[PDB]
Amino acid sequence: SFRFCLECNNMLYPKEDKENQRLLYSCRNCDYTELAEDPKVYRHELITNIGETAGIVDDIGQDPTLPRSDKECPECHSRDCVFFQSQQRRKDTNMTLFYVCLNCKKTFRDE
Template sequence: MSSPAASASGDGKKKAEQITFRFCSECSNMLYPKEDEAQRKLMYTCRTCNYSEEATSFCVYRNVLNNASGETAGVTQDVASDPTLPRAKQTCPACNHTESVFFQSQQRSAETGMKLFYVCCNSDCGNIFQ
């Protein structure tokens, strides 16, 4: 069972419903979701003054996971000075410096495989290449 707001687009993709905080109209404190067991309804209730209103949406929490991080996420120019990383005689395509450090792709999926990334050790460059 889906709500009209959840499937507003006709292409089969669900549009994420906006979740907002609700505040009491009497004392301005935050309203919290609570089930009215007698009427079997979702209500938003103030914990201070017991004000209550019926929920307009059944979604009270949504956790959105974003796993589209880049293969070289978190890599900075400081990586070149890290003594724990292995070094290679790989020429940088940007500045022709002949020393670089390398590491394996941090993205764990079948399509990335064993990709190696090189970071130029020239302090003025810091280019990341494969």
């Protein structure tokens, strides 16, 4: 996550002080400068799993084309649920199922 300038709404690029030895987020369109909280400047994931379970909506139980199972809900122990596979559509994607209860509407696995 990256922060924005509080006065002109531009991006806050990180900057390093030679004399003070501190990491600071500074806007290049002004003189505003705010002290950085964490040193994690950049992170790149070669193999990522985000978007696998992130594709979830709160009204997925009203879809009539989705199959319905009788798996046990971990939270409220309901007897009706709706399952589907991974929303990510790469070639390496697993065939595991995500179950959605019809009362608490949370996503849970079978393992």
